Amino acid sequence: TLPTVLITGASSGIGATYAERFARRGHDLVLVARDKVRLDALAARLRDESGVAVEALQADLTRPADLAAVEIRLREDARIGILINNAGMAQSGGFVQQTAEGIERLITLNTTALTRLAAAVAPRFVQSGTGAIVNIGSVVGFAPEFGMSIYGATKAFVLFLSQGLNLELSPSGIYVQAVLPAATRTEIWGRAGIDVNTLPEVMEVDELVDAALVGFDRRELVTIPPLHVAARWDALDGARQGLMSDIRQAQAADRY
Amino acid sequence: TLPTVLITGASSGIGATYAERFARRGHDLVLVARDKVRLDALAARLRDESGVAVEALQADLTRPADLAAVEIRLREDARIGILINNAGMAQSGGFVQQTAEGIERLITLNTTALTRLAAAVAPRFVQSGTGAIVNIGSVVGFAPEFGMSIYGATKAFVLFLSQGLNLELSPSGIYVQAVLPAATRTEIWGRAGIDVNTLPEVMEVDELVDAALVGFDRRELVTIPPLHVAARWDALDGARQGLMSDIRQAQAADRYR
Numbered sequence: 001t002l003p004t005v006l007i008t009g010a011s012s013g014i015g016a017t018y019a020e021r022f023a024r025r026g027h028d029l030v031l032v033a034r035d036k037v038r039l040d041a042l043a044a045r046l047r048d049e050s051g052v053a054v055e056a057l058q059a060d061l062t063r064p065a066d067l068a069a070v071e072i073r074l075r076e077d078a079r080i081g082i083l084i085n086n087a088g089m090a091q092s093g094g095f096v097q098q099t100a101e102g103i104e105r106l107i108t109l110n111t112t113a114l115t116r117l118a119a120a121v122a123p124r125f126v127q128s129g130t131g132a133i134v135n136i137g138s139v140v141g142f143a144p145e146f147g148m149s150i151y152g153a154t155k156a157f158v159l160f161l162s163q164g165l166n167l168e169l170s171p172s173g174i175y176v177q178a179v180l181p182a183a184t185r186t187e188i189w190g191r192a193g194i195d196v197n198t199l200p201e202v203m204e205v206d207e208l209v210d211a212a213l214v215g216f217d218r219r220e221l222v223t224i225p226p227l228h229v230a231a232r233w234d235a236l237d238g239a240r241q242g243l244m245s246d247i248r249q250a251q252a253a254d255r256y
Numbered sequence: 257t258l259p260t261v262l263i264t265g266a267s268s269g270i271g272a273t274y275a276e277r278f279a280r281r282g283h284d285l286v287l288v289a290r291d292k293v294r295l296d297a298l299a300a301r302l303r304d305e306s307g308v309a310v311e312a313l314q315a316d317l318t319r320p321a322d323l324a325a326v327e328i329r330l331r332e333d334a335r336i337g338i339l340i341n342n343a344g345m346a347q348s349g350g351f352v353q354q355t356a357e358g359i360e361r362l363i364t365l366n367t368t369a370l371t372r373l374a375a376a377v378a379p380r381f382v383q384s385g386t387g388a389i390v391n392i393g394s395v396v397g398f399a400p401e402f403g404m405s406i407y408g409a410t411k412a413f414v415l416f417l418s419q420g421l422n423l424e425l426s427p428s429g430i431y432v433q434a435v436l437p438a439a440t441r442t443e444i445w446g447r448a449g450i451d452v453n454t455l456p457e458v459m460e461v462d463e464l465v466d467a468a469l470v471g472f473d474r475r476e477l478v479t480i481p482p483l484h485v486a487a488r489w490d491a492l493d494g495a496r497q498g499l500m501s502d503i504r505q506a507q508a509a510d511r512y513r
């Protein structure tokens with residue numbers, strides 16, 4: 001029997017296409033987002049088209065009580081063996097046009113909620129010796145130049161967390177994937193007050209998810225569909241380790 | 257007249273040494289942390305020894321009302337021209353031993369509060385055409401191997417935010433520095449349930465801060481005192497840009513069909 005997949009941000013975009021795709025592979029699903037009505041239509045379609053069980057679970061992951069209720073479900077339901085931590089939003093406007101409320105929301109959703117859901121399944125996954133956590137990062141986490149300083153910071157967070165979780169949890173049989181899209185045709189752009197049609201280039205959501213799932217089936221750790229030269233990843237990671245090899249912690253460097 | 261410095265996490269460790277050092281340079285100070293009694297003693301010492309004004313400002317930066325009150329003070333007080341976003345904590349235990357409450361606290365302090373205080377001064381700094389934001393990251397943000405997956409993530413956040421803020425704000429005359437210590441002899445270790453004496457090597461807090469301040473005086477963007485070969489930073493940043501140069505966004509790469 002195939003594991004049930006809990007997907008956050010399942011109501012649209014990358015989340016919704018993951019849901020469609022996993023339903024077509026034969027997995028039962030738990031779909032979470034705020035828009036209950038839209039989730040109930042999507043769930044019904046997938047139950048009908050694919051014959052799997054699909055539950056629509058309303059939750060605002062920036063509301064403490066909703067998040068806690070999703071944590072509970074992840075801790076307690078042994079059927080759930082794949083977590084897609086996909087729910088996320090971009091930044092609207094530059095740094096000075098940010099608000100305290102907006103910063104709170106962006107960080108809580110993209111970072112705190114994602115990390116907490118992963119922490120809700122990890123103990124159970126360790127005990128069973130199996131499980132999968134797919135975290136959606138972004139190419140923007142490599143690009144302070146893109147101009148979304150906070151959002152990009154949240155996505156650097158998600159990449160790093162994913163790397164760290166792999167090292168901690170793969171020895172207990174857990175797969176931890178970071179998936180890093182670049183511009184993809186979803187509701188994120190309009191949510192942030194950007195017209196998606198003004199971006200030079202944008203990937204279709206079907207093509208991104210199928211690429212991501214090729215990565216998933218190969219059990220790839222870091223999956224970057226729009227990166228046309230794979231070895232740039234290895235070179236980035238090498239330079240990171242290279243830097244780490246020349247840390248001497250007892251004394252400040254001569255130049256200081 | 258020299259700008260007043262607001263320092264978070266001023267009651268001990270790196271924050272407290274920054275406070276001592278900036279007081280000796282002649283700056284007035286606003287010191288923030290939870291331990292009011294300890295802040296009042298430090299403030300009194302610095303007023304007496306150095307003859308600058310020093311205000312002790314109690315705040316738990318994980319409590320919404322306290323954080324909002326510090327934001328207000330940063331927005332409204334034109335004297336404050338340097339922000340040291342130093343308050344932070346490490347992770348206690350591995351990922352499976354984490355708690356919802358502990359995750360909330362660690363991320364809120366190291367990330368949300370830091371970002372919000374920076375956002376509280378930036379508009380005023382942009383308007384005045386001057387100002388400085390010093391964010392304390394960590395070498396651990398380069399090291400998923402170190403085993404603190406959440407804490408390290410918060411420090412990858414702080415580095416990235418710093419880089420982004422530099423590009424957004426230096427054109428308006430703002431200096432944004434990321435300071436990245438490695439193991440340094442402060443209260444962070446005991447807070448996390450680690451005996452600092454079991455670490456192979458640990459830098460004295462005086463030496464770290466003085467190194468950081470050499471960086472600050474040279475207006476260096478990314479300052480990593482324990483990195484003995486500077487060019488490893490440039491090579492990391494190059495590889496990052498190298499990767500960015502080979503992103504083609506319309507189509508998935510051949511290896512994914």
Ligand SMILES: NC(=O)c1ccc[n+]([C@@H]2O[C@H](COP(=O)([O-])OP(=O)(O)OC[C@H]3O[C@@H](n4cnc5c(N)ncnc54)[C@H](OP(=O)(O)O)[C@@H]3O)[C@@H](O)[C@H]2O)c1
Binds near residue numbers: 033087137
């Ligand atoms: N260009 C791209 O699309 C792109 C590129 C790289 C990475 N990403 C990442 O991809 C992920 C998916 O976003 P998308 O592109 O698929 O955008 P999307 O169409 O806006 O989907 C976002 C999903 O997250 C849910 N969500 C938003 N706020 C929420 C909240 N407070 N609580 C619970 N759920 C919430 C949304 O449903 P409700 O609004 O009904 O809650 C929606 O299903 C994000 O993490 C994003 O950072 C996107």
Ligand SMILES: NC(=O)c1ccc[n+]([C@@H]2O[C@H](COP(=O)([O-])OP(=O)(O)OC[C@H]3O[C@@H](n4cnc5c(N)ncnc54)[C@H](OP(=O)(O)O)[C@@H]3O)[C@@H](O)[C@H]2O)c1
Binds near residue numbers: 264291394438443447
């Ligand atoms: N090895 C290292 O020490 C090392 C290496 C790299 C980076 N860092 C970074 O250096 C920074 C300073 O830490 P440290 O090494 O100096 O440790 P520290 O001695 O524990 O100092 C932490 C300071 O932040 C304050 N703080 C803690 N929780 C707080 C809260 N909720 N609200 C407001 N303030 C709070 C503390 O005072 P109260 O508890 O009285 O509130 C204290 O003044 C951190 O951002 C840390 O991540 C440290």
